Amino acid sequence: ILSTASVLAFERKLDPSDALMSAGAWAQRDASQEWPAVTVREKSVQTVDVANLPSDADTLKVRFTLRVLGGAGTPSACNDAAYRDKLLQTVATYVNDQGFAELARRYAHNLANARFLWRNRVGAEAVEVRINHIRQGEVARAWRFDALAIGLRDFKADAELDALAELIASGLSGSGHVLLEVVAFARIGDGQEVFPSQELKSKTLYSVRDAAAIHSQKIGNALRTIDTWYPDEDGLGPIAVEPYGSVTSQGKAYRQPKQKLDFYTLLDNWVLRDEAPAVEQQHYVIANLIRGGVFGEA
Amino acid sequence: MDHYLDIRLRPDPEFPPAQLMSVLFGKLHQALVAQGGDRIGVSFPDLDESRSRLGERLRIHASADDLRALLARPWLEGLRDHLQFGEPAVVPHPTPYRQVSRVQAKSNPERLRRRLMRRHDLSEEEARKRIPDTVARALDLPFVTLRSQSTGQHFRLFIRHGPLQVTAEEGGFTCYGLSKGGFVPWF
């Protein structure tokens, strides 16, 4: 009969860190290891928390590390043994037909364009992203991208992006340990306002140790904006991979369960009754499994 | 002017239209300071007076060479993937005309109290009796929120599109694309 499992917990692949934002001047980004951190200072309007650059600094360096784990289809908790075997066989036939190649191409694109710079990117003058593959601590392979040449909407092929996608592919397929140190510089201007993540005196900003930062889940949600296979009206670009793939800013949920394009009905058709969907929809299902979560009833 | 360029916001998952509208207006203001002159004005075609909404279009009005200069300048760098451009094209005819002027208000009575202290050497109680709290004016106008580069304040710039007139008169514009006398064709 093979009903779905009553519990499924998938662990989060693509683990990011909290994105530490520091500050400095442009054209000395190659010496940006002792840059002073952007501090969250309080000011009176009520009182709010604001975060600005220094008045002699026109570059925001956001730095975080991203760990690509691999073993995507394997759940961390599952009741039904036969369902776990069927889902592992399903993901195995997925990886056998096509590796993590389109998914890692889109993840490498979302690392390449500095989409993890959320509001610090829409008014920037020139954005440069450097991505270092760290093996044994020093470096293994250095990348450098013009994040404004690489658009947020178009996933265009590139010679270096193919290499970063192959690295994230070798990470997601479990054939190697992948740890990426992702720095990103943003010409905002002298003393312009940066936008770290916002905590819960009305507005509190996120800081780790007297240094402003974006949450790790915000960087992870910026990395997951690869879903281009939803029913696309209105000319909206890629959205973040979610079950019933929804945008809270627009207030609209695409991939509604009325249509057969949400995560849950696609996974139940693919695993239980062997109705394998299109290559794009199964890319979406495997992107959800990389995203992780609690997929199961009560 | 006779040429116009329509700049529409693409819908974004991560940003509301008002935020991108404010950022586009700010980079436009910096572009007009970088260009100079009083010959360039703006308009908002999908404005909603009922909900006080600016819509998602900005229509800039200038000469053709000014628009083609503003297409290739770095004021749109970083905004090109949030926006989609039309072409600099000639305004259709006939069209009514209206003014696009910034409407400021006395929304801070305490600031006017400090101004009366600075200009008349009065006290706090003299200023508070001379200026009560009821002079504050809240506006039913759509607005964009900009941050200044000279001073460190963030301010809501409220906009009112004036009444429709059948013809245009001579007048210049500020460095925000707003009417200091000038009129834009409304269509």
PDB file of N, CA and C in Angstrom, chain A residues 170-225:
ATOM      1  N   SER A 170      29.648  18.522  -6.238  1.00  0.00           N
ATOM      2  CA  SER A 170      30.443  17.530  -5.531  1.00  0.00           C
ATOM      3  C   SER A 170      30.185  17.577  -4.037  1.00  0.00           C
ATOM      4  N   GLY A 171      29.755  18.727  -3.525  1.00  0.00           N
ATOM      5  CA  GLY A 171      29.332  18.786  -2.138  1.00  0.00           C
ATOM      6  C   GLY A 171      28.001  18.099  -1.912  1.00  0.00           C
ATOM      7  N   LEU A 172      27.007  18.418  -2.744  1.00  0.00           N
ATOM      8  CA  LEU A 172      25.658  17.910  -2.533  1.00  0.00           C
ATOM      9  C   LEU A 172      25.551  16.429  -2.843  1.00  0.00           C
ATOM     10  N   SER A 173      26.439  15.907  -3.681  1.00  0.00           N
ATOM     11  CA  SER A 173      26.425  14.488  -3.986  1.00  0.00           C
ATOM     12  C   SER A 173      27.206  13.666  -2.977  1.00  0.00           C
ATOM     13  N   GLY A 174      27.816  14.299  -1.986  1.00  0.00           N
ATOM     14  CA  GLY A 174      28.532  13.582  -0.958  1.00  0.00           C
ATOM     15  C   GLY A 174      29.906  13.110  -1.352  1.00  0.00           C
ATOM     16  N   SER A 175      30.412  13.533  -2.502  1.00  0.00           N
ATOM     17  CA  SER A 175      31.721  13.113  -2.971  1.00  0.00           C
ATOM     18  C   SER A 175      32.841  14.036  -2.521  1.00  0.00           C
ATOM     19  N   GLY A 176      32.614  14.864  -1.510  1.00  0.00           N
ATOM     20  CA  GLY A 176      33.666  15.722  -1.010  1.00  0.00           C
ATOM     21  C   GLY A 176      33.175  16.715   0.017  1.00  0.00           C
ATOM     22  N   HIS A 177      34.043  17.111   0.937  1.00  0.00           N
ATOM     23  CA  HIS A 177      33.694  18.135   1.909  1.00  0.00           C
ATOM     24  C   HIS A 177      33.841  19.497   1.254  1.00  0.00           C
ATOM     25  N   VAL A 178      32.786  20.301   1.295  1.00  0.00           N
ATOM     26  CA  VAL A 178      32.777  21.610   0.657  1.00  0.00           C
ATOM     27  C   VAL A 178      32.456  22.655   1.710  1.00  0.00           C
ATOM     28  N   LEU A 179      33.377  23.586   1.912  1.00  0.00           N
ATOM     29  CA  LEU A 179      33.177  24.733   2.780  1.00  0.00           C
ATOM     30  C   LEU A 179      33.611  25.973   2.023  1.00  0.00           C
ATOM     31  N   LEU A 180      32.694  26.912   1.843  1.00  0.00           N
ATOM     32  CA  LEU A 180      32.942  28.108   1.055  1.00  0.00           C
ATOM     33  C   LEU A 180      32.919  29.327   1.955  1.00  0.00           C
ATOM     34  N   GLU A 181      33.952  30.152   1.864  1.00  0.00           N
ATOM     35  CA  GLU A 181      33.999  31.428   2.565  1.00  0.00           C
ATOM     36  C   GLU A 181      33.587  32.506   1.582  1.00  0.00           C
ATOM     37  N   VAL A 182      32.426  33.099   1.807  1.00  0.00           N
ATOM     38  CA  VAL A 182      31.821  34.012   0.854  1.00  0.00           C
ATOM     39  C   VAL A 182      31.877  35.420   1.418  1.00  0.00           C
ATOM     40  N   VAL A 183      32.771  36.245   0.889  1.00  0.00           N
ATOM     41  CA  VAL A 183      32.792  37.662   1.212  1.00  0.00           C
ATOM     42  C   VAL A 183      32.095  38.381   0.072  1.00  0.00           C
ATOM     43  N   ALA A 184      31.627  39.596   0.332  1.00  0.00           N
ATOM     44  CA  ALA A 184      30.959  40.383  -0.693  1.00  0.00           C
ATOM     45  C   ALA A 184      31.063  41.853  -0.346  1.00  0.00           C
ATOM     46  N   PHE A 185      31.594  42.636  -1.272  1.00  0.00           N
ATOM     47  CA  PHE A 185      31.799  44.060  -1.075  1.00  0.00           C
ATOM     48  C   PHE A 185      30.741  44.834  -1.840  1.00  0.00           C
ATOM     49  N   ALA A 186      30.282  45.939  -1.267  1.00  0.00           N
ATOM     50  CA  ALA A 186      29.196  46.706  -1.857  1.00  0.00           C
ATOM     51  C   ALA A 186      29.481  48.195  -1.753  1.00  0.00           C
ATOM     52  N   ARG A 187      29.682  48.842  -2.895  1.00  0.00           N
ATOM     53  CA  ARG A 187      29.853  50.290  -2.937  1.00  0.00           C
ATOM     54  C   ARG A 187      28.507  50.935  -2.666  1.00  0.00           C
ATOM     55  N   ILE A 188      28.242  51.278  -1.414  1.00  0.00           N
ATOM     56  CA  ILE A 188      27.014  51.972  -1.064  1.00  0.00           C
ATOM     57  C   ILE A 188      27.228  53.475  -1.025  1.00  0.00           C
ATOM     58  N   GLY A 189      28.386  53.910  -0.542  1.00  0.00           N
ATOM     59  CA  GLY A 189      28.686  55.323  -0.429  1.00  0.00           C
ATOM     60  C   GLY A 189      29.232  55.654   0.941  1.00  0.00           C
ATOM     61  N   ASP A 190      29.751  56.865   1.122  1.00  0.00           N
ATOM     62  CA  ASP A 190      30.352  57.260   2.393  1.00  0.00           C
ATOM     63  C   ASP A 190      29.274  57.408   3.454  1.00  0.00           C
ATOM     64  N   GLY A 191      29.344  56.569   4.482  1.00  0.00           N
ATOM     65  CA  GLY A 191      28.460  56.691   5.620  1.00  0.00           C
ATOM     66  C   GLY A 191      27.022  56.331   5.358  1.00  0.00           C
ATOM     67  N   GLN A 192      26.738  55.659   4.251  1.00  0.00           N
ATOM     68  CA  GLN A 192      25.374  55.294   3.930  1.00  0.00           C
ATOM     69  C   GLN A 192      24.892  54.182   4.851  1.00  0.00           C
ATOM     70  N   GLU A 193      23.576  54.060   4.951  1.00  0.00           N
ATOM     71  CA  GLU A 193      22.956  53.149   5.897  1.00  0.00           C
ATOM     72  C   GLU A 193      22.999  51.729   5.364  1.00  0.00           C
ATOM     73  N   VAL A 194      23.476  50.807   6.188  1.00  0.00           N
ATOM     74  CA  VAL A 194      23.430  49.397   5.863  1.00  0.00           C
ATOM     75  C   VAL A 194      22.215  48.802   6.551  1.00  0.00           C
ATOM     76  N   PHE A 195      21.848  47.597   6.142  1.00  0.00           N
ATOM     77  CA  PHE A 195      20.618  46.968   6.604  1.00  0.00           C
ATOM     78  C   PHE A 195      20.925  45.567   7.100  1.00  0.00           C
ATOM     79  N   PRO A 196      21.297  45.425   8.363  1.00  0.00           N
ATOM     80  CA  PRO A 196      21.411  44.098   8.955  1.00  0.00           C
ATOM     81  C   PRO A 196      20.029  43.566   9.295  1.00  0.00           C
ATOM     82  N   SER A 197      20.004  42.318   9.735  1.00  0.00           N
ATOM     83  CA  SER A 197      18.744  41.678  10.046  1.00  0.00           C
ATOM     84  C   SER A 197      18.179  42.267  11.325  1.00  0.00           C
ATOM     85  N   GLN A 198      16.882  42.106  11.512  1.00  0.00           N
ATOM     86  CA  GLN A 198      16.162  42.890  12.496  1.00  0.00           C
ATOM     87  C   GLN A 198      15.557  42.000  13.570  1.00  0.00           C
ATOM     88  N   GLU A 199      15.900  42.281  14.817  1.00  0.00           N
ATOM     89  CA  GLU A 199      15.513  41.436  15.928  1.00  0.00           C
ATOM     90  C   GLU A 199      14.192  41.890  16.525  1.00  0.00           C
ATOM     91  N   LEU A 200      13.843  41.277  17.646  1.00  0.00           N
ATOM     92  CA  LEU A 200      12.653  41.651  18.382  1.00  0.00           C
ATOM     93  C   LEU A 200      13.007  41.960  19.831  1.00  0.00           C
ATOM     94  N   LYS A 201      11.500  51.555  22.628  1.00  0.00           N
ATOM     95  CA  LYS A 201      12.373  50.735  21.796  1.00  0.00           C
ATOM     96  C   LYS A 201      11.569  49.899  20.813  1.00  0.00           C
ATOM     97  N   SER A 202      11.573  50.319  19.548  1.00  0.00           N
ATOM     98  CA  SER A 202      10.773  49.646  18.536  1.00  0.00           C
ATOM     99  C   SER A 202      11.581  48.689  17.677  1.00  0.00           C
ATOM    100  N   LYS A 203      12.694  49.146  17.113  1.00  0.00           N
ATOM    101  CA  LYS A 203      13.441  48.371  16.135  1.00  0.00           C
ATOM    102  C   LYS A 203      14.785  47.988  16.724  1.00  0.00           C
ATOM    103  N   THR A 204      15.046  46.690  16.797  1.00  0.00           N
ATOM    104  CA  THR A 204      16.321  46.183  17.264  1.00  0.00           C
ATOM    105  C   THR A 204      16.988  45.428  16.126  1.00  0.00           C
ATOM    106  N   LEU A 205      18.265  45.709  15.906  1.00  0.00           N
ATOM    107  CA  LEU A 205      19.019  45.084  14.836  1.00  0.00           C
ATOM    108  C   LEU A 205      19.848  43.932  15.381  1.00  0.00           C
ATOM    109  N   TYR A 206      20.096  42.960  14.517  1.00  0.00           N
ATOM    110  CA  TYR A 206      20.843  41.778  14.901  1.00  0.00           C
ATOM    111  C   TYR A 206      22.326  42.084  14.962  1.00  0.00           C
ATOM    112  N   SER A 207      22.950  41.679  16.060  1.00  0.00           N
ATOM    113  CA  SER A 207      24.388  41.820  16.214  1.00  0.00           C
ATOM    114  C   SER A 207      24.898  40.601  16.954  1.00  0.00           C
ATOM    115  N   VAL A 208      26.078  40.126  16.575  1.00  0.00           N
ATOM    116  CA  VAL A 208      26.634  38.953  17.234  1.00  0.00           C
ATOM    117  C   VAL A 208      27.459  39.349  18.454  1.00  0.00           C
ATOM    118  N   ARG A 209      28.546  40.088  18.261  1.00  0.00           N
ATOM    119  CA  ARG A 209      29.316  40.581  19.397  1.00  0.00           C
ATOM    120  C   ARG A 209      29.772  41.992  19.036  1.00  0.00           C
ATOM    121  N   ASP A 210      28.902  42.963  19.327  1.00  0.00           N
ATOM    122  CA  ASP A 210      29.099  44.379  19.007  1.00  0.00           C
ATOM    123  C   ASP A 210      29.441  44.580  17.532  1.00  0.00           C
ATOM    124  N   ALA A 211      28.738  43.855  16.668  1.00  0.00           N
ATOM    125  CA  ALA A 211      29.006  43.870  15.233  1.00  0.00           C
ATOM    126  C   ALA A 211      27.743  43.416  14.535  1.00  0.00           C
ATOM    127  N   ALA A 212      27.203  44.254  13.653  1.00  0.00           N
ATOM    128  CA  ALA A 212      25.929  43.970  13.008  1.00  0.00           C
ATOM    129  C   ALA A 212      26.039  42.753  12.107  1.00  0.00           C
ATOM    130  N   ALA A 213      24.910  42.088  11.889  1.00  0.00           N
ATOM    131  CA  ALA A 213      24.945  40.857  11.125  1.00  0.00           C
ATOM    132  C   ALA A 213      23.571  40.564  10.561  1.00  0.00           C
ATOM    133  N   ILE A 214      23.556  39.828   9.472  1.00  0.00           N
ATOM    134  CA  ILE A 214      22.338  39.265   8.919  1.00  0.00           C
ATOM    135  C   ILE A 214      22.187  37.872   9.500  1.00  0.00           C
ATOM    136  N   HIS A 215      20.945  37.457   9.756  1.00  0.00           N
ATOM    137  CA  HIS A 215      20.679  36.121  10.265  1.00  0.00           C
ATOM    138  C   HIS A 215      21.147  35.072   9.272  1.00  0.00           C
ATOM    139  N   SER A 216      21.442  33.881   9.781  1.00  0.00           N
ATOM    140  CA  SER A 216      21.859  32.813   8.890  1.00  0.00           C
ATOM    141  C   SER A 216      20.701  32.315   8.053  1.00  0.00           C
ATOM    142  N   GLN A 217      19.486  32.336   8.598  1.00  0.00           N
ATOM    143  CA  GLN A 217      18.349  31.877   7.819  1.00  0.00           C
ATOM    144  C   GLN A 217      17.970  32.864   6.731  1.00  0.00           C
ATOM    145  N   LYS A 218      18.337  34.137   6.872  1.00  0.00           N
ATOM    146  CA  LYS A 218      18.098  35.089   5.795  1.00  0.00           C
ATOM    147  C   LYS A 218      19.055  34.862   4.640  1.00  0.00           C
ATOM    148  N   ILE A 219      20.313  34.552   4.945  1.00  0.00           N
ATOM    149  CA  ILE A 219      21.266  34.180   3.908  1.00  0.00           C
ATOM    150  C   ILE A 219      20.842  32.883   3.240  1.00  0.00           C
ATOM    151  N   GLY A 220      20.316  31.945   4.025  1.00  0.00           N
ATOM    152  CA  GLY A 220      19.847  30.699   3.453  1.00  0.00           C
ATOM    153  C   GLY A 220      18.612  30.867   2.597  1.00  0.00           C
ATOM    154  N   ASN A 221      17.734  31.795   2.969  1.00  0.00           N
ATOM    155  CA  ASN A 221      16.566  32.074   2.149  1.00  0.00           C
ATOM    156  C   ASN A 221      16.944  32.816   0.883  1.00  0.00           C
ATOM    157  N   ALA A 222      18.009  33.607   0.926  1.00  0.00           N
ATOM    158  CA  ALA A 222      18.492  34.225  -0.298  1.00  0.00           C
ATOM    159  C   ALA A 222      19.159  33.206  -1.204  1.00  0.00           C
ATOM    160  N   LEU A 223      19.761  32.166  -0.630  1.00  0.00           N
ATOM    161  CA  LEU A 223      20.352  31.131  -1.471  1.00  0.00           C
ATOM    162  C   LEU A 223      19.299  30.242  -2.104  1.00  0.00           C
ATOM    163  N   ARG A 224      18.135  30.124  -1.490  1.00  0.00           N
ATOM    164  CA  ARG A 224      17.111  29.227  -1.997  1.00  0.00           C
ATOM    165  C   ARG A 224      16.244  29.845  -3.077  1.00  0.00           C
ATOM    166  N   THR A 225      16.448  31.112  -3.442  1.00  0.00           N
ATOM    167  CA  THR A 225      15.636  31.736  -4.488  1.00  0.00           C
ATOM    168  C   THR A 225      16.097  31.217  -5.845  1.00  0.00           C
TER     169      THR A 225
END
